[PDB]
Amino acid sequence: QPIIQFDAESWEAEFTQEIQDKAIEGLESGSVLFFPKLNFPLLTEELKFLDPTWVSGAKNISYDPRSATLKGVEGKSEDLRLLSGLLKRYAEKTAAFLHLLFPFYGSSLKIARTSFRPVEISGRATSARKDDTRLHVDAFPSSPTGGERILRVFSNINPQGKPRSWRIGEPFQNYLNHLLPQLSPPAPGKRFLLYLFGITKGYRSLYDHYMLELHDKGKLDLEYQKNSPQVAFDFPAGSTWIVFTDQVLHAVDKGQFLLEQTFHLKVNALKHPEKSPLKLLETALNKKLVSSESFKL
Template sequence: MPVHAIPQDALSPASPVREQRIRVWCTQLEAGGILYFPETPVLVPYADVEFLLGQQKCSSSLHKNIAYKPGRDKLSGIDEKSAGPDKVQRMHEIMRRYSSSVEAFLVEFLSPYQRRWRLDYASFRPVEEKGRDLSMRHRNDLLHTDAFPTRPTRGWRILRFFHNIHPNRTRDWVVGEPFARVVREFAPVKLALPRADGPVARAGKQFAQATGIASLVPQWKRTPYDAFMMRLHNTMKEDTAFQAGCQREEVQFASGSSWMVYTETVPHAVLGGQFALEQTFLVDPAAMVTRDSTPLEILEKMTGHVLA
C-alpha cells in the first residue's frame, strides 16, 4: 500500500503546479494510498498539546477515546464529575478548535471535492495501543476496513485525518492489500455478497422509517452496502488464517506528523503508539476525482445491483 510523502513546500499557495498536484494527490488517496505529512499542516497550539499530553491514560475521568461531535458541538468520553468542569471545558475547546482547523485545511487541500462531505466525529486517543485488552471485534491491532455499527455511511467514503502528538514516539501501523483484492478473497467464498433489497425488505424499511423505528435500530438504517461492509469488518478480524498469512506492510508515523487515508478502503491495524488526534469525514462518492475506485462502485460492479 503506497505512502505518499507530501513536503511542506508543496503546500504553498504560491506553487505554480499546486492545483495540478492536488488532483494527483486526490487520485492517490482515492486509490487507497496514504497521504503523509512529515510535518503536520494543521498546527495545534503548544498549550493545547501540553494539556492533552498531561492527561493520564489510566485516569478514571477518561475513556479510551474522547469524541467530539461537531454537528452538535458535544463532547463525550470524559466524566465531568471526576474531571471537573474546568478540565471538561478546556478539552471541549481544544477538540472544537482542532476539528475546525482540520476542516479548514482540507477545504483548500481537497479543493476538487468542493466540500462535499459531512463532518463526522473528531477524537483524542490518549491510551497506549500496544497490548490493549479488547474483544476481537474491537481490537485495533487486527487488519480491518472501517465500518460504523450505528452510523451507516450509505456508500459515502470514510476519510480520516490523523495527527501523532506524542513528543518522541512513532505511531505504528500495518496496512494490507487493496480493497478490490481483499474483497474478492472474502466474497463470496467466506462472506455473502451484498444484494439489493427485495420488495418485502423494502416495505419493512419504509414502515420503520415512517414510524421512527429506523432511528433506533441500526440494521434498519443500513443499506445493503453498509450491511456488507460491517460483515467484512468483523470477518476480517475473526479470520485467523487471513490475519496470519495476508500480505502487509509496516508504516511508522513520526512524532509531529499527520496522515490521511480512506479507512473503509485500506485494510489497516494500529500496533503501537499513544496520544493521537483524529478527524473523520464522510465524503460523497460523487465528489471523487476517480469514482471507479470507491468500494461502492467496486461492489456494485461485482454484484450488478445498486447497493446504496
C-alpha cells in the same frame, strides 16, 4: 504505492495543482497521504490532557464540531472547556487543510466527529471484531454510512517522540475478492429491526451490511491476517496523515496520543467514483446497495 509522502508543514499554506492532483489521485487509489512534518501543536494549558485518565467510559474522547458537543470525558467545566477547545481547533485546522488540498471536492466534504485517543495501543485487548491490531476497513455497526466515504485525518501528538505503528494492507478490491466466498446476505427483516430498536443510527444499507461483513470476517480470517500483503510503517510524532479508512486496509499495533477527524463524502463527489468501495461492491454483487441512491441516466 501504499504511502505517498508530502512536504507541507503548515496547516494553512496553499498547494500547487500538481500536488493537489497527486493527493487526490493517491487518496482515491487507496494510498495513505503522509505529512511527516505537519505537527499539530498544543497549548501549554492543553498538555495536561496527554493523560489516559481523562477517558471515562470509552477509549476515545469525541467532539461533534457541528453541535460543539464533547463526549466520553468527565470533569470540571473549565477542563471540559479546554478539552473542547483542543478538539474544536483540530476540527477547524483539518477542515481548512482539506479544503486547501482537495478543491475538487468543493463543499461536498462534510465534517463528522473528532476524537482524541490517549490510551496506549499496545496495552489493548478485546473482541476479535474490535481488535484494531487486525487489518480491516472501517465499518461501524451502530453508524451506517449509506455509501458515503469515511475520510480521516490523523495526527500523532505523542510528547515523548513515540511513533504510531500501523500496518497497511492490500488493495480493497483484492480484500473484497478474498473474502467474497465468505460473504452472506442479511437475514430478512433484521436490519429494519435494528433501525426500529435504535441499535443503528439510521438504516443499515446493504452496502453497510457487506462492509461490516468484510470488516468482521476479515478480522476472523487468521490466515489472511498473518499472510496477506502488508507493510508496517511508523508514523512519527509530529506527523499527520490522511486516509479513506473504508478503503485502505489498516491496523494499529502501538502508540499513544492521537487526534483524529472524520469527514464524510458522497460517492458522486469523487473524481473516480468507480474506485469506491460502494461501486466495487455493487459491481461485484451486480446490485444497487443503497436504497436512496440518487438516480441517474
